[PDB]
Design a protein around this ligand. Structure first.
Ligand SMILES: *[C@@H]1O[C@H](CO)[C@@H](O[C@@H]2O[C@H](CO)[C@@H](O[C@@H]3O[C@H](CO[C@H]4O[C@H](CO)[C@@H](O)[C@H](O[C@H]5O[C@H](CO)[C@@H](O)[C@H](O)[C@@H]5O[C@H]5O[C@H](CO)[C@@H](O)[C@H](O)[C@@H]5O)[C@@H]4O)[C@@H](O)[C@H](O[C@H]4O[C@H](CO)[C@@H](O)[C@H](O)[C@@H]4O[C@H]4O[C@H](CO)[C@@H](O)[C@H](O)[C@@H]4O)[C@@H]3O)[C@H](O)[C@H]2NC(C)=O)[C@H](O)[C@H]1NC(C)=O
Ligand SMILES: Cc1cc(COc2n[nH]c3c2CCN(C(=O)c2ccc4[nH]nnc4c2)CC3)c(C(C)(C)C)cc1Cl
Ligand SMILES: Cc1cc(COc2n[nH]c3c2CCN(C(=O)c2ccc4[nH]nnc4c2)CC3)c(C(C)(C)C)cc1Cl
Ligand SMILES: [Ca+2]
Ligand SMILES: [Ca+2]
Ligand SMILES: [Cl-]
Ligand SMILES: [K+]
Ligand code: NA
Ligand SMILES: [Zn+2]
Length: 796
């Protein structure tokens, strides 16, 4: 119910919401239909527009005007933003030279630099260049402040998931806004762009920035802006709030523009109609900067210019229809568009079978423009599985396309020429970041980074302790002049054992069908003499309680888990000059590790589905003496034959190719167990599948971290400076149904699979409980940046 009898006189855009009886005058009142009857008249004034003119300079204040050009307007904080330019001969901010902001230059009473988050919907990364001639204000922010060439959104690359990720530092699976449309089966409730259900606070998880702020005594302005409040009024409202007294004035503000996204949907990302929305947003930026300059805050405030996602060319004709694949199409519910989510139309349908749906959608047409996945099989970098709001069956849609259930959906609903939502590594989905202000660096370019990292930085900018989140706090220290966050490396929880030779060969029953110059040399390789070569960045630290052994070898070093019966990690360096050799069913006991903590070949013989591979690649053995170490039982891991095709091509072909290209590489490989798809290391008791008749757990994924010298004129093993990394988390699957070309030679499809399953080191850390890069010559923040890097394989 609504009770509207009171007045907004002197209360327009008041910050503290009032409850009934009082009617409302805050920015959300319109959305809750609770505004005082005189809200429009008093709070949404438009008379005489938004600009002072010479003829208004010095006017008698008329309270009906949208903004003021009277002598008192500065002290009231309600001048039109161009007042000082038109009436006091000042220059527009954009026409002033950039001058370094070394320290905050704030009015008396300011306890910290305010932060203004200027968010632009659908602002594609390449607009910064392509639109440069029509966006002088934005171009000034970008060139004078700190900017990235692009910022990576989260998947799906939709608005509410991205904006809420910016606010929380969380992946969508964790904050709960997993799409623009959702069904929660626990609550039996549907979230839609249109309607009331989205206002229910149960949808919105984590702790968004305005709550983190409030809880720590830092006041916040609105983040949500009602669509009908024109941009000019939003800006003036922010500027009025910044004129408030010390104990009422917010320290954090947000502005949101629905452009260029609104036009981008109609016209496509580079339609000729797009130039005017870009000019208009730039003008709004210049209003804000001029307004701040009037208030003497343009060298006080930190401004973040940020987008939620990009925009791709998508038309009605490029729609895939499930009715062309499914005979049972009326038995499913599809969440459609630039991603697909399928569930049963009725939970009382006992014929509904996901496996049959997935099979009917798999590689059925040669140019098929989507791929079906069970959500646990999506690339782990998407972090898109661990929420009951995410349907088990997912369709990853190719850029430029849509999926829909039936054609009648796409003509009873061409209109649009642009859309977004695709895989967050797609170039068209990239968006923008610029930071301008005293706390940001001056004329500095930083590498691309992920939007999950910004919450921590905004907390650093405001002196807040961030809520637990998915950023890696310190990885964006390089954006900041001051207020850097300086963490310590996590403490190692489990110390390694260093077993020597403790077992005789006859103590083992594996079922595997099998000179003092080179005797002290093999002893010393088992005691760790080449370890400097193969373990370039220190041993990984184990951040959980467990029992493991460090095993040294001529060609590789491993941390062998006595609990999972295989390595957690295997580390080796392949020089540019290394040779690849030919290679059978010999697996040898490791006399350092007990039979009881080893695998055996019999289990593999009995398990007709499961085979085995090796973590250190026998192909890359340095000498035929070293080659025996590659066939130790402690280097064996369980592998489906289907996956062995992938792994062998990586090991036999790709590692050497990378060493050639990168001037040596250091590789760390290992298993991952994530049966509950939460992106976190499984405990022993979460493992769902073992090699038949054994306690050998089956990994869900295999990782590798491939490190070399950023200056590739230096070899990986003698690198003086910054490092370069690429990594992957490959799904350990019993088929290659993912790869529609897999009947062909591995050179036509394996590398494509690996690229899709590219990963950050930090993803692997979450999944393994390991901490890498413990002993480098690099600063710890530089290393945290390195650990967040993702090799995306998209051109510039
Ligand atoms: C990205 O960053 C985030 C943030 O750090 C990481 O997520 C954290 O991960 C932790 C592990 O998965 C998790 O810790 C659990 O918290 C439980 C209490 O959680 C509630 O309270 C917090 C605190 O304010 C709140 O934030 C939570 O919010 C979640 O749930 C609500 C609604 O249900 C959502 O609105 C909200 O979006 C959020 O949902 C997300 O997380 C939940 C899981 O909490 C998922 O289900 C959702 O899909 C979504 O992803 C909650 O309101 C606590 O109960 C857990 O403890 C169990 O396990 C331990 C073992 O250590 C045991 O000791 C406990 O007793 C307990 O076990 C008992 O319960 C079991 C399950 O019912 C039962 O089987 C057992 O037998 C036992 O009885 C645990 O401490 C933390 O909640 C989330 N936080 C958030 C915000 O997501 C995330 O991991 C990072 N991602 C990566 C990849 O690094
Ligand atoms: C949680 C949530 C609810 C509803 O709705 C609301 N009901 N209540 C609020 C909202 C909007 C968000 N919000 C603010 O924008 C805000 C923040 C700080 C302030 N300080 N002062 N005013 C302020 C206003 C908090 C309060 C939405 C949608 C998008 C559906 C509107 C999104 C979200 Cl994340
Ligand atoms: C800086 C910041 C601001 C905001 C405020 O965002 C909004 N204020 N006003 C609107 C929004 C979102 C878009 N919106 C849509 O319905 C919409 C728009 C474009 C679309 N394109 N495709 N689908 C679309 C759906 C409604 C208008 C938030 C929160 C979390 C409060 C939303 C967090 C942060 Cl960090
Ligand atoms: Ca958007
Ligand atoms: Ca897990
Ligand atoms: Cl969606
Ligand atoms: K087998
Ligand atoms: Na296949
Ligand atoms: Zn959009």
């Amino acid at each position: 119910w609504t009770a509207t009898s009171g007045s907004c006189k002197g209360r327009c855009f008041e910050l503290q919401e009032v409850g009934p009886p009082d009617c409302r005058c805050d920015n959300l009142c319109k959305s809750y239909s609770s505004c005082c009857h005189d809200f429009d008249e008093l709070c949404l004034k438009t008379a005489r527009g938004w600009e002072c003119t010479k003829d208004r300079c010095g006017e008698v204040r008329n309270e009906e005007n949208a903004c003021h050009c009277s002598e008192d307007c500065l002290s009231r904080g309600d001048c039109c933003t161009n007042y000082q330019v038109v009436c006091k001969g000042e220059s527009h901010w954009v026409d002033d030279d950039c001058e370094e902001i070394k320290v905050p230059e704030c009015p008396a009473g300011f306890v910290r630099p305010p932060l203004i988050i200027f968010s632009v919907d659908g602002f594609r990364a390449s607009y910064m260049k392509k639109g440069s001639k029509v966006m002088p204000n934005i171009e000034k922010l970008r060139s004078c402040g700190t900017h990235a060439p692009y910022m990576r959104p989260v998947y799906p690359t939709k608005t509410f998931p991205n904006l809420y990720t910016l606010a929380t530092g969380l992946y969508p699976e964790s904050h709960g806004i997993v799409g623009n449309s959702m069904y929660d089966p626990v609550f039996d409730a549907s979230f839609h762009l249109r309607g009331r259900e989205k206002f229910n606070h149960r949808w919105w998880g984590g702790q968004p920035l305005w709550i983190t702020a409030t809880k720590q005594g830092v006041r916040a302005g609105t983040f949500f802006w009602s669509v009908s409040i024109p941009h000019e009024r939003r800006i003036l409202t922010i500027l009025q709030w910044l004129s408030l007294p010390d104990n009422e004035r917010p320290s954090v503000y947000a502005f949101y523009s629905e452009q260029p996204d609104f036009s981008g949907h109609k016209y496509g990302p580079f339609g000729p109609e797009m130039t005017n929305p870009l000019r208009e947003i730039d003008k709004t930026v210049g209003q804000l900067m001029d307004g701040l300059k009037q208030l003497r805050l343009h060298r006080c405030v930190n401004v973040i210019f940020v987008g939620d996602h990009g925009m791709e060319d998508v038309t009605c004709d490029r729609t895939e229809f499930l009715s062309n694949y499914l005979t049972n199409v009326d038995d499913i519910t599809l969440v459609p568009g630039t991603l697909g989510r399928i569930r049963a139309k009725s939970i009382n349908n006992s014929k509904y079978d996901p496996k049959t749906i997935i099979a009917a959608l798999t590689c059925k047409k040669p140019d098929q423009h989507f791929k079906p996945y069970m959500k646990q099989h999506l690339p782990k970098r998407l972090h898109y599985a661990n929420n009951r709001r995410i349907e088990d069956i997912h369709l990853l849609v190719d850029r430029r396309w849509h999926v829909a259930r039936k054609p009648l959906d796409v003509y009873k609903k061409c209109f649009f020429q642009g859309d977004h939502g695709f895989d967050n590594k797609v170039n068209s989905m990239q968006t923008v970041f610029v930071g301008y202000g005293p706390t940001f660096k001056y004329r500095t370019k930083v590498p691309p980074f992920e939007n999950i990292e910004l919450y921590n930085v905004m907390c650093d900018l405001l002196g807040l302790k961030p809520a637990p989140n998915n950023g890696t706090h310190g990885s964006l220290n390089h954006l900041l002049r001051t207020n850097t966050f300086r963490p310590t490396m996590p403490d190692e929880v489990s110390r390694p054992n260093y077993p020597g030779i403790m077992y005789l060969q006859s103590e083992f029953d594996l079922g595997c069908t099998c000179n003092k110059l080179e005797e002290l040399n093999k002893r010393l390789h088992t005691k760790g003499s080449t370890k400097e070569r193969h373990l370039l960045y220190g041993r990984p630290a184990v951040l959980y309680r467990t029992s493991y052994d460090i095993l040294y070898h001529t060609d590789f070093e491993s941390g062998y888990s006595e609990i999972f019966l295989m390595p957690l990690w295997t580390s080796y360096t392949i020089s540019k000059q290394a040779e690849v050799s030919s290679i059978t069913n010999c697996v040898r006991p490791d006399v350092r590790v007990s039979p009881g903590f080893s695998q055996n070949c019999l289990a593999y013989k009995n398990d007709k589905q499961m085979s085995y591979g090796f973590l250190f690649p026998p192909y890359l053995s340095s000498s035929p003496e070293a080659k025996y170490d590659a066939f130790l039982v402690t280097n064996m891991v369980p592998m489906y034959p289907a996956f062995k095709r992938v792994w062998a091509y990586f090991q036999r072909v790709l590692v050497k190719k990378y060493a050639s290209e990168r001037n040596g590489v250091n590789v760390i490989s290992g298993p991952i167990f994530d049966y509950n798809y939460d992106g976190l290391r499984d405990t022993e008791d979460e493992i769902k599948q073992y090699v038949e008749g054994s306690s050998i757990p089956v990994p869900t994924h295999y990782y590798s971290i491939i490190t070399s010298c950023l200056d590739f004129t230096q070899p990986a093993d003698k690198c003086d400076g910054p490092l370069s990394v690429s990594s992957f988390i490959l799904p350990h699957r019993p088929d290659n149904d993912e790869s529609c070309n897999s009947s062909e030679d591995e050179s036509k499809w394996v590398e494509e699979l690996m690229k899709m399953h590219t990963a950050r080191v930090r993803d692997i850390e979450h999944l393994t409980g390991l901490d890498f890069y413990r002993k480098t010559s690099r600063s710890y923040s530089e290393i945290l940046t390195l650990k967040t890097y993702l090799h995306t394989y998209e051109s510039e």
